[PDB]
Amino acid sequence: AQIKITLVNSPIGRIPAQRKTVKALGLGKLNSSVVKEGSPAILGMVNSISHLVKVEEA
RNA sequence: AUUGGAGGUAGAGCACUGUUUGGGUGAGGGGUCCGUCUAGGAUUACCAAUCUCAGAUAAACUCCGAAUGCUAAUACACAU
């Protein structure tokens, strides 16, 4: 499963344990779809951070 | 993200320290009279000496015991 990564919310107004995670995925402005790394357990990014990104199978 | 530990916090029940509701349990301590060789046997009365059974009760209760988080290694992702 190879998944690209989207956005639904600005990072303003959340935990820095969300800020640095979005930073770790490295998107910058919104919905710059980082077409990368659908390997699991950094699916913990897409699932711990699941309030934020549509799972888009790249 | 997984594994590894650690912490007793919240919660709870009471396992101890505290407080406490009943019910049972009882010397005794104050009410007949026999009665001050003579003490008493007493009547019931408040607690009934504990303990027993349910009922709780808490920051300085904890036989327990989280979820969270913190840390170690590993994994993957990055760039510090």
Question: What does A1-58 look like in DSSP terms, one character per residue?
Answer: --EEE--SS-STTS-HHHHHHHHHHT--STT--------TTSHHHHHHS-SS--EEE-
Cβ of A35 < 7 Å from strand B? no
The structure's method of determination equals: cryo-EM
Cβ of A19 < 7 Å from strand B? no
To one decimal place, what's the resolution in Å?
Answer: 5.6
Q: What span, in angstroms and rounded, lies between the C-alpha atoms of A57 and A21? A: 20
Cβ of A48 < 7 Å from strand B? yes
Q: Which residues pair with A4 in a beta bridge?
A: A56
Q: Which value, to the nearest 10 degrees, does the dihedral of the CA atoms of residues A19, A48, A43, A23 take?
A: 0
Task: Please report, rounded to whole angstroms, the spatial distance between the CA atom of protein residue A8 and the C1' atom of nucleotide B14.
Answer: 51
Both tokens of A14, joined, read 């959340």
